[PDB]
């Protein structure tokens, strides 16, 4: 019951999913052949959340994979746990977008999306009670940031009451791999605010910083960043698949973390994270988890959370632990940092406890906090956008496929209005 379907688009989203599904399968004891080989009874009670049942007793994820080029899905199939995905759900084009948002949203993405919407509708109509959808995509690419966001609007138009999740990677100015990143980032943020019920920003720069400083491993690769993102993704829905002292589905988090409908851009972090050589030194206790949870360097975004004030915060503890300690520590982390918490909403931290810890760990915490410090990312994105747009650089590529500069002006104005009205509440006082 109350299950969700998985939809991913683009190369970055496909690579994120290729590790997210591996993590989920390892958590539920599903072999790469789709056969259950788990140890505990609880591993099968709520498997309908992510997995479907077919004849022969094997399980198949309800994931939908889409891209405008076939290479990435032809590569993910040969990887581990690549056989679980149903071949029918693979939809792809023969041309690609070339990191051009217009091509992936107006000319090419519009004709292809009917086929993927057909299978999306097939998956949603069938399921017992829908909880919602979760979306993984990147804002630094053309086909992803175009087709995914248009699909968001199409899904929202047909299921207005369901919940919608988006895990979005925004292009940081530090590690830049594409010159046309500001254009399709700014165009995508315009559409994303209007339809997504929840959005979670993730930055490659913050992932590299975490890998270099906390884990202290010499050579980070995309596999480590994907693993961290996958652990963070799994931590959110853990209590929906396992029993606990205070169950809290996604809708309950939506109620408690979004004060106003347009303020739904969160930054997350996962604890504990320790190096291989120091994993024996540390002792896992609730104070040790909560001190690392609110650490500024532990956030999955380069945004500095002590440059603003938290509107609200959430924590999803895992493992068996006493609730009194959790509540007193949450109170203590809020009394010692009163300057960084907005004062006109008292008791702005939500807590939840799940009795099933991750495989290999005795305690774990997932942190989701809505803070005013996120304005800095939109500020720098808009700064680069307006630095590049004033000369009409690279504009002809977009304008040759039916798009105009008016949609750029409206997007810039709406993004600046969002930036302004997000900080409006930072200076608000009672």
């Amino acid at each position: 019951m109350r299950e969700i379907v998985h939809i991913q688009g683009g190369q970055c989203g496909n690579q994120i999913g290729a590790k997210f599904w591996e993590v989920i399968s390892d958590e539920h004891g599903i072999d790469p052949t789709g056969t259950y080989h788990g140890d505990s009874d609880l591993q099968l009670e709520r498997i309908n959340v992510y997995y479907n049942e077919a004849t022969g007793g094997r399980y198949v994820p309800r994931a939908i994979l889409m891209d405008l080029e076939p290479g990435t899905m032809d590569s993910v199939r040969a990887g581990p746990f690549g056989q679980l995905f149903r071949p029918d759900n693979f939809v792809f084009g023969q041309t690609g977008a070339g990191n051009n948002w217009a091509k992936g949203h107006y000319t090419e993405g519009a004709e292809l999306i009917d086929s993927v919407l057909d299978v999306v509708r097939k998956e949603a109509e069938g399921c017992d009670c829908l909880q919602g959808f979760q979306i993984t995509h990147s804002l630094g690419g053309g086909t992803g940031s175009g087709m995914g966001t248009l699909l968001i609007s199409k899904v929202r138009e047909e299921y207005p009451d369901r919940i919608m999740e988006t895990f979005s990677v925004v292009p940081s100015p530090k590690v830049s791999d594409t010159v046309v990143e500001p254009y399709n980032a700014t165009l995508s943020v315009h559409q994303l605010v209007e339809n997504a019920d929840e959005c979670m920003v993730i930055d490659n720069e913050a992932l590299y910083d975490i890998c270099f400083r906390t884990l202290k491993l010499t050579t980070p690769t995309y596999g480590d960043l994907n693993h961290l993102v996958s652990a963070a993704m799994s931590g959110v829905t853990c209590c929906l698949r396992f029993p606990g002292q205070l169950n809290s589905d996604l809708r309950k988090l939506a109620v408690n973390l979004i004060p106003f409908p347009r303020l739904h851009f969160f930054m997350i972090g996962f604890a504990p994270l320790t190096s291989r050589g120091s994993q024996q030194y540390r002792a896992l206790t609730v104070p040790e988890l909560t001190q690392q949870m609110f650490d500024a360097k532990n956030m999955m975004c380069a945004a500095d959370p002590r440059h603003g004030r938290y509107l609200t915060a959430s924590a999803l503890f895992r493992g068996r632990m006493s609730t009194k300690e959790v509540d007193e520590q949450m109170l203590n982390v809020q009394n010692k940092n009163s300057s960084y918490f907005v004062e006109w909403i008292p008791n702005n931290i939500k807590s939840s406890i799940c009795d099933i810890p991750p495989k290999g760990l005795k305690m774990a915490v997932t942190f989701v906090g809505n803070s005013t410090a996120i304005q800095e990312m939109f500020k720098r994105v808009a700064e680069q956008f307006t630095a590049m747009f004033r000369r009409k650089a690279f504009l002809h590529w977009y304008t040759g496929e039916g798009m105009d500069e008016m949609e750029f002006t409206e997007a810039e104005s709406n993004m600046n209005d969002l930036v302004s009205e997000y900080q409006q509440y930072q200076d608000a006082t009672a």
């Binding site: 520590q329 109170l331 009394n335 010692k336």
Partner: protein, 49 residues
């Protein structure tokens, strides 16, 4: 009268400064384990050392 007027004018600043510094000291007494009551935490947070 002039000091009381100034203290009223700047009361919001003085109260922000008071609240900012009143919880910055390391008191071993109020380490989270032995503060049995919310009232004791509230009383400590209302004092500056």
């Amino acid at each position: 009268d002039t000091i009381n007027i100034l203290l009223r004018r700047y009361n919001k600043i003085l109260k922000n400064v008071f609240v900012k510094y009143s919880n910055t000291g390391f008191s071993a007494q109020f380490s989270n384990k032995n503060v049995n009551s919310f009232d004791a935490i509230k009383e400590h947070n209302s004092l500056i050392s």
